[PDB]
Each structure stands twice: as structure tokens, then as C-alpha cells.
């Protein structure tokens, strides 16, 4: 138990000190390591339940049972007299830098998870390199350090969402007494994109400074794992070379998919291209029905666009379908057109994009509805949002032995280990895990702590909350209503629900019974909250806090005994009483 | 014992049926009562764990042990055969209306708590009257049914806060690409007031409709308790008469104080007058430093007023003081002037309010600072927010025997009972309790269930969350940092904290390090979260959900293992790590 933990910790930590808070000999070693600029992990034995057992287990490695004890890459280095000796004799630097590999850690991929892992590992003295390269899109788009979220995901997505929310703010301002006239105000797309790209640029810069300040080596190069410890890198000048590392973290993420139809790659675009587009898309078709599809269609419409979404079958597959339908109806009532039960057959080019005058081209889209009727219509821009996929065939030689699943994602144990014992995987390519930036960050930081600082905490992937930033936002935590009924049966499930109206919407003359909330509960388990769902403004701020209560096992009774904050939207969760089985109306 | 529960339930219920869900005889009785339009409480014995015991004790009243058993105001009425006998003999209506008093319940006060209590009591067959009257302010302001929050509190306050928030939305919109020029836009006070008052008018009317549809008698009259069961009422036409009731609930609230100085009552106003003022206040002095004072000063500045606050000692006495200082510092940087350590001595009239042209008058304010120096300045409007107090002399005859404390508030047990066994008190006049609208509603609804439906649940008044709606809002749940240190000792307290910047502020070029949050925790109790604090946009939405987790006993480990929603402000709580004891900066 304790014995196997100690061996695992000593074997993979890069530099680690065993210590007690009250020991002046340990203080003297800490001071020497600080002065020499030697970073290391520290375990304070006097602060652990079984420090006594741990102190005795150290002797199986060092043949002594006192503190301090210094180790470098699995090897006992000395007590305080020995460490001081090495320091005085100018020998300490060379010992702590002695390694069988170029790096203690190589991270392949410089996104949300990889950056977080690399920075955390370096704080405990691991000699670390992070590799990042951005393969250009079909039309040539490329961007800087930071990954999908920073450059072409969460960050620019929510900034343009905000630009679209401000259009309703301008409308609302008239009713609250401001003198503007919403009817004579227009939006400039390229002004918005300049502002968004300037913030992304400051993040690109920020991460390069953060890696330099943590002594992480940053290589803007494509990586390929060719054996368990060898990473082949290719330059921006196509220079090829090989580096070695003790531990390897794969953190390379995904890229958008294209359907195999004529004209799709040549004439359409994806979200990768959209957030830095130099011209307003104009009349736009969005193909797909994921949260990416619906979020982009939504802000394009709020910014004055003529927008259609082409839906193969359902909206938001895998989310609660009653919530998904309310999301779609609101978008349709505020402008967005939907072509339902429809797929595309080809894209034809009527006009080439005008780089000179900064204007889109023109396309003819042909398709069919599931009953066989035909679809034919002209658009200026066609955005494909039909899923994302890893491309590990590039990153990973088949002979290394890292196992993939039928979608090409990496099969991992619950501590992120692959089938190759020194190789781990995090973020979107970890099979079966929620594909979200806070998950990738948590997994990468927690893993770095286990490898290099002796931590034991695992990442908990259950009941992770989400928010879809559609024009009216949708927050959720836990099971959908249909999944709860599937798992436990209808008679064991109670659902509490209510409509509501934000106070901010009253003077503004907005809709009475559009926002909506429900709790899905299990009768036989003290009416445990199995899932929470809210459609309304600031849905992500509303939901975040409740995700702690659900993690702790909240029941309906816990929600009833907590008091509301007034006036808020979130307080409605604390007074729910209408059940779906009663058949009583949920309106206000 | 189960028997003394059953006893109190039978004596206090107006009309109650003891039943079982599977018995078709109870079903015949239920339908008879439904058709004769008789409302009643129902206790389903085949759902409570000791229903067997209760069935036994019913015999102490009815001499039978079967089900159904119907009771009216403490008296057993019959089983299925007997209830049906009364029905087909036209005797049933007279038996259920037989009472010693005019009403089962008289509520004095038609505000947050009173209306909630009255409506809930009526759902169980209690014959209920709700009394309400609004004594005019010194200048004659009056308003309709609904209480302080609805008319001159939370509702109009938060609508004017939103009007102020929208001026920064107009500034922000330019950076997000919208073509408006903020510098050329002004605000119209009276247009805002008309929209705000039209919403308040729909609430006044909605409450009258709700009372009518619940068969609650509403009397717009001043009530006075002269003996335990007798309430004397006075007409709008000065007509005096007496009504009697079994149970009495006092829910009459508070009104603002004036300082005892020359000119205050004659020439100043308070919050009661502000929300329906027909002219813009103009250059305004707010005297006081409560949440009412800072909230009013804050939106007045955002709507374009010249605004000054005069502070006797500190801001937000009784709230966490590090947070109160950050609140005031934000306001001072955005155009609220403060006159610190200062009190007023007199108000001189220089110009009378111009009713015709819809213009304020002009006043001269004279005061002094704590050193000795003097204050003298003219203002168009002077608003007093120096506290609120009850006026129970008006409501309660001294001889009835209801004990008050030294502030004039009613001393109650933990079930809201006064020193007179049939008289209860709820809301702002219940001594010792948080003075908040959702607390009054929970107290009133829960009490009505105990009196008329055999409920046992009590209101929980601990760790009730709050939000102050200053220009930058401040949400809190639990202890301030100073209260926690004083209760447990500095060595047993750990504080995690961080600055943050909302994503929405990046393109808008707003401030990097003004928003702030912290968790105040107890080391020796598993790092239990004692208090949560957040300064930022949408702070009430952010805080509300964490209140459930704090109710359930959340620890720091619970916050750490929960995953954030990205991008939100609230997610910063899931990754806090900088302790105050460490000395490391909290900035970003
Ligand atoms: C449009 C959109 C919006 C989103 N919005 C949200 C949101 O609001 N909230 C949320 O939580 N999540 C959101 N997500 C999801 C979020 O972006 C991902 O979960 C996250 O970025 C995945 O992180 P990662 O570290 O796994 O991979 P990535 O962030 O994709 O980083 C992988 C990096 O490695 C690089 N790379 C690939 N192969 C190699 C190689 N061989 N050598 C070197 N480098 C390589 C890639 O080019 C990339 O830079 C959104 C995603 C999209 C597409
Ligand atoms: C400016 C301001 C802002 C506020 N903002 C908030 C906020 O954002 N959130 C929050 O939770 N709380 C807020 N509050 C507090 C909230 O308004 C009170 O806690 C709440 O109104 C108390 O309700 P109540 O039922 O105790 O009394 P009230 O709502 O004051 O109702 C009592 C009613 O009884 C009437 N009455 C009095 N005497 C008699 C009599 N003898 N006969 C008949 N009728 C009588 C009164 O005129 C009144 O109509 C605010 C308060 C103020 C002043
Ligand atoms: O082989 S390539 O065509 C594709 C991979 N690239 C690596 C790269 C891109 C940017 C910097 O480094 C070199 C040429
Ligand atoms: O001077 S008063 O008697 C005037 C009338 N009363 C009660 C009342 C009910 C409706 C309007 O007014 C208050 C004091």
C-alpha cells in the first residue's frame, strides 16, 4: 500500500525532497536548492497520516530513515551533509541535470490540456518540452500558440456571441429611457474581428511568456511518436530530428470534418476559418446541428445576417431533446430559418471570393429532404459544422503499440495511461471523456502532479456541467430526462419544472413564458437530483454553482431548504413545486 | 410523540381529511368535497412511515381506526357514510362553515410575507382575510398592494440598476463593432419611471386577482390588534369596526428613518419617494452608507447625475469590510463622490420644488467632519437612507401582551410564535432574522403549512445568501472574513482568493484587476467553506447556486473536484489556490 506508492513516487519524480516542516536541516537543504535555482517537489512527512510508515519505507532506497532525503530521477542523492558537500564542491548542478533522456516530459500539442500539463510539471523540476504546430486549413488559415479554444473555439465564439447580445441591449435601452434609435444603427464585421483577433494575439503572446518563465522549451514543430521514448520533430523549414523523453503526454486535439460531396473542401469553410474571416459572410448556410452549428448561426443572425441551418435529423443530439427543441424554437422566432430533415449533395461556385474589395463569393447548394423532395438555393458562405475528429495516424506510428478505439481516440485507464506504460493522453483525444477545455486543463494538471510530485488525486469526469451559448443560453448538469427514465424507469422519476421571466425583460417587453427550468429527480433515492436544466440569460453563471451541490449528492429537499437571492433568475430553482405528473401548467 | 403531533394538527386545521391513496371510499369523499367546492388539507397515511401509529391515535378523537376520517376546526365530522349523509341532506356546507371566529386567519400586512402566508393558508380551506394599508410619506407618496419590495424596494431598485448597466452596454457596443456614438446619447428620467411604474401596476393588480381566485378577503384598511382574537379596522372613509380571527399573523414591515435635524422631514426624501419621483433628482446628496444608499447613489451616477454620498463612519456596516471597500472604490473611480467621516446638521430650503415645470428645488446642506471641520454645499435633491424601523405602537395594543425587544421588533420562538399563543410574526419585524424578501415568503408559506396542513418543517435562517446591486455587484453567502477569524482564531482560518477579468471586458477595454473573489475556510474542520464572496457582474446569478452547496456543508475539496464551465466568471471558484497566508499576489 504505502510501499507501492513510495516506489512509484521515487521512480518517476525528477527532483524530490522528503522533509519535515520543523527540521532545520531540511530548511538548510531547501535554502541551497533555492539559491542554486533548483526546482523540486517536497513531501512534508510530519503532515501525512502515515508519515511514520513512509519514513521507514525510504530506507529500502537510501538505507537511512531520517530527513531530509534528496532523490534525482529514482536515485538517492544524499542527506544534508552530502548535499551541502556537492554544493560546496560545485558538483550539485551536474548531478541534478543527469538524465538518460533529453527531457523528463515531452508534451505533443500546445493547447488547453498540453499547456496546462507542461507548466504544472515544470514547477516540480521536470525538464519539459511542449511541441505545437497548426496544420493550415484548406484555404490556408493558420494561428498561434494556445489550441482550438484560444484561437478558433470558446474565446472568439463567446466574444461574437457577446457582440450579438449587445444588439438586444441596444433595443432594450430605449424602453429604459435612453435616447438612441436602434433602427438606424448597423454592425461592422471587420471592426469586431480586429478586436477579437487582438485579444487572441495577446493570449498567444501570454503563453509564450509563461513557458519561458517556467523554463519550458517551446518548439513550433510537428511531433511524431516513433518509439516509446523517441519523438521525431519536423521544422518549419522541414528539418527533421529526434528528441527523447522519459514521459510522453499526447495532447493533439481534433479538427473539423467535411462531408464527401463535390465542392465542400473547395468552396465551403469551417469554424476554423470563420473567426478570422476578413469579410462578412453575408447570406449564410450552416450545415449541421451541433452546438457549434447553432452557436455560429445564432450570433450571425443577431449581427444582421440572413441565416439558414440545414438539419439532417435532430438538434443537439445527445442533449435533452425537450431543451434542444426550446433552443431551436427561440432561434426560429428571432430570425433563423431551418431546413429540417435535409442533407447536401453538392456545392457549385457561381462567384470567386473577392480578396480585393473584401467581399464573399456566391454558391449554389443542392440537396434533398428525407422524403426525396429536392433542395436548391443560393448562398454567399457555406459553413460546415458536421463533427470533429482526431488524426492520430499523423502523430503516432502504429508500431509503438498505443491502442485506439473505433473512432480513432486513445484508450486510457482512469489515470490517463495508454497501453504503453510511459505514455499518457489528455483532452479531446482521450476516448469517452467529455470534450471540454476545463476538463482537459484539470486532467493535465492533476496528471503532472501524480507523475512528478507524488500526488494521488484522479480527475472526476462524472456530472460535468455544460453551457450552449445560443442566443438564449442553455445550461445543464447531469442526466437528460429521457436518459434518467431509460436508466430507472418512468415510475421512479419525478420532474419539477417552471417557466420564468427575467425582471430585465419586463420593461423591455420581451417574452413571458420562453425561459424554462426543470429538476429531474429519483423517487427511490430521497428524490436525488439526477440532472439540472436551464434555458435563459447568463445560463452558465446560473449553473456553475449548482454543479458543486450535485457533486455532493443534492436532493430536492436540499434545494427547498436553501433560500433564494432576490431578484434573480437563479432563485427560481429554490421554490420549484409543479411536477410533470400532476399535469399542472408550468407557465407564470 | 406522534400523539401530540396529531393533537395539534387536529385542533389547528380548518378542514382536514385523513386518507389513503388506494381506498375508493376516500376517493368518493374527495370527489364530494371537490364538487361542493370545499377546500381542505389531506394527510395520506399510506405514505408516512408511522401511519399505523397515527391511525391508532385518531381513535382518541373519533373512536374509529379506519379511513377516511374528516375533521373541521378540531371536531370529528364522520366517515364516508356520514359525510355522504350530510351532503344529500344539504347539511354539509353549514357544518364546514361553522366557526367561533369570523376568520380562521387574519393577516395584518399585505407585503412579501403576508400575501404568501394568506394565499398558502387558503389552499387548505382556512377562511382568510388579508389587511393592507400604506401610510403616506411626509410629501404624500402612496402606492398599491404588494409591500415594500414590490413598490419601493427590490423591484423598482433593480429595474433602475438595469437602466444604469445599459449605459455601459452602449459604450461596450462600439468596441464590438456597432456604429453608435455613445457620447451623443442621453437619458430621460421620466420615460424610465413610467415604464417601471407600469410594471409595478401590473403586480398590484396581479395580487388582487390572486387573492380573489383563492377566496381570500382583501380589506384595504389599517388593522390594530386589541385582544388576542380581535382586530379593529379603519376604512378609507374613517369607519371603525371589529373582526375576529382564530390565528393572527403580524406582517407589517418597516418604513425609513429620518435624522432628528432641522429641515430633514420638510426638504429631504427617502427611497419611498425616489422610485415614483416625477422629476429627475439632478445634483443629489445621499446621506448614509447602507446597501440602500450605495445602490441608489450608484445608478443615479450611471444615468448622468452629479452624486455625493456622506458617510458617518464606514460602508456596509455588518458586511465583510475588505469587500465593502472594493465596492466603494469602484464607485469612486466611476464618478460617485464621497464625503467621508461626516454627518449632517441641517437642511436649508433655497428653492421650492416646481410642480408645474417638473423640476427639483434647491437645498443647502450644512454639516461637519469628525476632526471638527465644516461641510457646506448646495444640492437639488437630498435622500436619507439612514435605516428603517417598525412602528408597532400603531399595530399592536400594549395590553394584548405581545413582547417586543429594545429595537421595537417582535420576540418569537423558532416557529414564529409570539408570547401570545395564537399570534405569530413574520418578515422584517421578527427580531433577529435576515430582513430579505425570500426569507419572509419562506417563513410565511411554511408557517401556513404548520397551522393548517399538519406540516412540521421549520424555516432555516442560517447562511442565507445576499447580493448588493451596486454598479459592480457584490454577492456573499456565510461569514465575513473578520467574523470567522474572531469566532475561530486566525490560526484556524485559511483564505483562498483571486482577481479575475470577465471575457466580455476584454474587447470593451475595461479594467484588469477590479473583480475579486475569495473563500473563507476552517482548517480544523476539513477546510469547510465558512463564507463565499464575489465582486463582479451578475453576482447574484453567480452566488445563488453555491448557497445550496454551503447549506450541505461544502469543503474546499468539494470546490476543487467540481469542474468549471468555460467561459464564465463563476468558474474561477473551481480552481482557487492562492492563500492569503502565502503572500502571493492575487492579480491576473
Ligand atoms: C467552435 C468551438 C467552440 C468551443 N467552445 C467551447 C466552450 O465554450 N467551452 C468549452 O469548455 N469547450 C469548448 N470547445 C471545446 C474546446 O475547444 C476543446 O475541448 C479543447 O480545445 C481541446 O483541448 P485539447 O488540449 O484536447 O486540444 P487542442 O486545444 O485542439 O490543442 C491541440 C493542439 O495540438 C496541435 N497539434 C496537433 N497535432 C500535432 C502534432 N503532431 N505536433 C504538434 N502539435 C500538434 C494542434 O494543432 C493544436 O494546437 C469548443 C470547440 C470548438 C471547435
Ligand atoms: C430600497 C429597498 C431595496 C430592497 N431590495 C431588496 C432586494 O434586492 N432583495 C431582498 O431580498 N430584499 C430587499 N429589500 C428588503 C425587502 O423589501 C423586505 O425584506 C421585505 O419587503 C419585507 O417584507 P415584509 O412582508 O416583512 O414587509 P413589507 O413588504 O414592508 O409589507 C408590510 C405591509 O404592511 C403594511 N402595513 C403596515 N402596518 C399596517 C397596518 N397597521 N395595517 C395594515 N397594513 C399595514 C405596510 O404598509 C406594507 O404594505 C429592500 C428593501 C428596501 C427598502
Ligand atoms: O512537413 S510539412 O509540410 C508540414 C509540417 N510543417 C511543420 C510546421 C508548420 C509550422 C511550423 O512547423 C513543416 C512542413
Ligand atoms: O387618517 S386615517 O384614519 C385615514 C384612513 N386610515 C385607513 C385607510 C384605509 C385605506 C385608506 O386609508 C388611515 C389613517
Coordinates of N, CA and C in Angstrom, one line a residue, chain B residues 247-309:
Chain B
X247 N -56.4 32.4 14.4 CA -54.9 32.7 14.3 C -54.7 34.1 13.7
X248 N -53.7 34.8 14.1 CA -53.3 36.1 13.7 C -51.9 36.1 13.3
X249 N -51.6 36.6 12.1 CA -50.2 36.8 11.7 C -49.9 38.3 11.5
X250 N -48.9 38.8 12.2 CA -48.4 40.2 12.1 C -47.3 40.2 11.0
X251 N -47.5 41.0 10.0 CA -46.6 41.1 8.9 C -46.6 42.5 8.3
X252 N -46.3 43.5 9.1 CA -46.5 44.9 8.8 C -45.2 45.6 8.4
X253 N -44.0 45.0 8.5 CA -42.8 45.6 7.9 C -42.3 46.8 8.6
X254 N -41.5 47.6 7.8 CA -40.8 48.8 8.3 C -41.0 50.0 7.3
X255 N -40.6 51.2 7.7 CA -40.5 52.4 6.9 C -39.2 53.1 7.2
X256 N -38.7 54.0 6.3 CA -37.4 54.6 6.6 C -37.4 55.6 7.8
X257 N -36.2 55.7 8.4 CA -36.0 56.7 9.4 C -35.5 58.0 8.8
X258 N -35.8 59.1 9.6 CA -35.2 60.4 9.3 C -34.3 60.8 10.5
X259 N -33.2 61.5 10.3 CA -32.4 62.0 11.4 C -33.1 63.2 12.0
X260 N -32.9 63.4 13.3 CA -33.6 64.5 14.0 C -32.8 65.7 13.9
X261 N -32.8 66.4 12.7 CA -32.2 67.6 12.4 C -33.1 68.5 11.7
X262 N -32.9 69.9 11.8 CA -33.8 70.8 11.1 C -33.8 70.6 9.6
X263 N -35.0 70.6 9.0 CA -35.2 70.6 7.5 C -35.3 69.2 6.9
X264 N -34.9 68.1 7.7 CA -34.9 66.8 7.1 C -36.2 66.3 6.5
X265 N -37.2 66.3 7.4 CA -38.6 65.8 7.0 C -39.2 66.8 6.0
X266 N -39.0 68.1 6.2 CA -39.6 69.0 5.3 C -39.0 69.0 3.9
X267 N -37.6 68.9 3.8 CA -37.0 69.2 2.5 C -36.3 68.0 1.9
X268 N -36.0 66.9 2.6 CA -35.4 65.7 2.1 C -36.5 64.7 1.6
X269 N -36.0 63.6 0.9 CA -36.9 62.5 0.6 C -36.2 61.2 1.0
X270 N -36.9 60.1 0.8 CA -36.2 58.8 1.0 C -36.5 57.8 -0.1
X271 N -36.2 56.6 0.0 CA -36.4 55.6 -1.1 C -37.9 55.4 -1.4
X272 N -38.8 55.6 -0.4 CA -40.2 55.5 -0.6 C -40.6 56.5 -1.7
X273 N -40.0 57.7 -1.8 CA -40.4 58.7 -2.8 C -39.6 58.6 -4.1
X274 N -38.4 57.9 -4.0 CA -37.5 58.0 -5.2 C -38.0 57.3 -6.4
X275 N -38.7 56.2 -6.2 CA -39.0 55.3 -7.4 C -40.2 55.8 -8.2
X276 N -40.9 56.8 -7.7 CA -42.0 57.4 -8.5 C -41.8 58.9 -8.6
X277 N -40.6 59.4 -8.3 CA -40.4 60.9 -8.4 C -40.7 61.4 -9.8
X278 N -41.5 62.4 -10.0 CA -41.8 62.9 -11.3 C -40.8 63.7 -12.1
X279 N -39.7 64.1 -11.4 CA -38.6 64.9 -12.0 C -37.3 64.2 -11.7
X280 N -36.3 64.4 -12.6 CA -35.0 63.9 -12.3 C -34.5 64.5 -11.0
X281 N -33.8 63.8 -10.2 CA -33.2 64.4 -8.9 C -32.2 65.5 -9.2
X282 N -31.4 65.4 -10.3 CA -30.4 66.4 -10.5 C -29.2 66.2 -9.6
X283 N -28.5 67.3 -9.3 CA -27.4 67.1 -8.3 C -27.9 66.6 -7.0
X284 N -27.4 65.5 -6.6 CA -28.0 64.7 -5.4 C -27.0 64.4 -4.4
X285 N -27.4 64.6 -3.1 CA -26.7 64.1 -1.9 C -27.4 63.0 -1.3
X286 N -26.7 61.8 -1.1 CA -27.3 60.7 -0.4 C -26.6 60.6 0.9
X287 N -27.4 60.6 2.0 CA -26.9 60.6 3.3 C -27.1 59.2 3.9
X288 N -26.0 58.5 4.2 CA -26.0 57.2 4.7 C -25.0 56.3 3.9
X289 N -24.9 55.0 4.4 CA -23.9 54.2 3.8 C -24.3 52.7 3.9
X290 N -25.6 52.4 4.0 CA -26.2 51.1 3.8 C -26.3 50.6 2.4
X291 N -26.8 49.4 2.1 CA -26.9 49.0 0.8 C -28.0 49.8 0.0
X292 N -29.0 50.3 0.7 CA -30.0 51.2 0.0 C -29.3 52.4 -0.5
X293 N -28.4 53.0 0.3 CA -27.7 54.3 0.0 C -26.8 54.0 -1.2
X294 N -25.9 53.0 -1.2 CA -24.9 52.8 -2.2 C -25.6 52.4 -3.5
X295 N -26.7 51.6 -3.4 CA -27.4 51.2 -4.6 C -28.1 52.4 -5.3
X296 N -28.7 53.2 -4.6 CA -29.4 54.4 -5.2 C -28.3 55.4 -5.7
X297 N -27.3 55.7 -5.0 CA -26.2 56.6 -5.5 C -25.6 56.0 -6.8
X298 N -25.5 54.7 -6.9 CA -24.8 54.1 -8.0 C -25.5 54.2 -9.3
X299 N -26.8 53.9 -9.3 CA -27.5 54.1 -10.6 C -27.7 55.5 -11.0
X300 N -28.0 56.4 -10.0 CA -28.1 57.8 -10.3 C -26.9 58.3 -11.0
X301 N -25.7 57.9 -10.6 CA -24.5 58.3 -11.3 C -24.4 57.8 -12.8
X302 N -24.8 56.5 -12.9 CA -24.8 55.9 -14.2 C -25.8 56.5 -15.2
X303 N -26.9 57.1 -14.7 CA -27.9 57.8 -15.5 C -27.5 59.2 -15.8
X304 N -26.3 59.7 -15.3 CA -25.8 61.0 -15.6 C -25.9 62.0 -14.5
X305 N -26.3 61.6 -13.3 CA -26.4 62.6 -12.2 C -25.0 62.9 -11.6
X306 N -25.0 64.1 -10.9 CA -23.9 64.5 -10.1 C -24.2 64.1 -8.7
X307 N -23.5 63.1 -8.1 CA -23.9 62.4 -6.9 C -22.8 62.4 -5.9
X308 N -23.2 62.6 -4.6 CA -22.3 62.6 -3.5 C -22.9 61.7 -2.4
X309 N -22.1 60.9 -1.7 CA -22.6 60.2 -0.6 C -21.8 60.6 0.7

